[PDB]
Ligand binder design. Structure first.
Ligand code: 6EN
Ligand code: MN
Length: 300
């Protein structure tokens, strides 16, 4: 069965260290850049409200067939449904509780992880899920409060609208001679395959609420090694594809990378926790259940 990779670093900054995100990320860099990803738990009393327009939040998630690569009237597999945040959560909880035959919060994270990777390589069982991925924060607002006048800000919420850890306040303009956060409404087994960011950018990721998001990360010093293992084992039909396109279907069991000498670290990002990916740190993951994440690429 699946062997969980070693855990990535988790930092619990004090209020003093939590003052400046870029300063903190710069200070943890000697360790975190050697693991590719890391997790940051804010101080206990740092609890931003959820600021999306929930009444009007509507979206059509994308269908994900977990074993599509292994499986190589097709094209009309599933029927698309539009959801609200509530109706998607109802669907997501019903799927998970039916699949595991237990209440959603009782399913061990290790079991969802083991079952996810079994399903990815299974030819005898076709599991299909839906992912509300890459919803722009312009559509229904950011999950963080933003002082743009579109939604009321309470006095006790203003500090979060001005916080440097508010993803809308991360720097995004790269220096050159010559960008807003994105939202992810997850369900059990919804996933993102191995990739790096455009321009080898850092990314920061915040789980607003819900069940955890499970991550895998590879340090940048092993980026070429991972790409080598990909070219060896990825389908021949997608081998010659440019990286930007190949990254749409670069799903690979972490144990396969580990067996080929590639260092891989994991974490369960829980509600209220940040995940930072360092430059050229390949990462991939899946959601344990119904959750809501916000992410943005930033520069230092
Ligand atoms: C472009 N894009 C980004 C996705 N998701 C992530 C990317 N990087 C880090 C985290 C995530 C996440 O899903 O939490 C994604 C999932 C499905 C299709 N397209 C996607
Ligand atoms: Mn990413």
């Amino acid at each position: 069965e699946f062997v969980p990779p070693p855990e990535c670093p988790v930092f619990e900054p004090s209020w003093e260290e939590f003052t400046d995100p870029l300063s903190f990320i710069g200070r943890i860099r000697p360790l975190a850049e050697k693991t590719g990803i890391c997790k940051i738990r804010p101080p206990k009393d740092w609890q931003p409200p959820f600021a999306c327009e929930v009444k009007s939040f509507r979206f059509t998630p994308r269908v994900q067939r977990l074993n599509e690569l292994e499986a190589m009237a097709f094209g009309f597999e599933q029927a698309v449904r539009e959801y609200t945040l509530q109706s998607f959560g109802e669907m997501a909880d019903n799927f998970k509780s039916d699949y595991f035959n237990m209440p959603v919060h009782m399913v061990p994270t290790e079991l969802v992880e083991k079952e996810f990777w079994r399903l990815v390589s299974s030819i005898e069982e076709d599991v299909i899920v839906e992912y509300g991925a890459d919803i722009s924060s312009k559509d229904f607002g950011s999950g963080f409060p933003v002082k743009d006048g579109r939604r009321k800000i309470l006095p006790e919420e203003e500090e979060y609208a001005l916080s440097g850890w508010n993803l809308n306040n991360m720097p995004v303009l790269e220096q050159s001679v010559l960008k807003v956060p994105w939202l992810y409404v997850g369900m059990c087994f919804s996933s993102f395959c191995w990739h790096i960011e455009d321009h080898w950018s850092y990314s920061i990721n915040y789980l607003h609420w819900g069940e955890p998001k499970t991550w895998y990360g590879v340090p940048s010093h092993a980026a070429e090694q991972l790409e080598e293992v990909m070219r060896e084992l990825a389908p021949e039909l997608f081998e010659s594809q440019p990286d930007l396109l190949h990254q749409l279907v670069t799903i690979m069991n972490p144990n396969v990378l580990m067996e080929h000498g590639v260092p891989v670290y994991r974490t369960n990002q829980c509600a209220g926790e940040f995940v930072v990916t360092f430059p050229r740190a390949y990462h991939s993951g899946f959601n344990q259940g119904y959750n809501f994440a916000e992410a943005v690429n930033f520069c230092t």
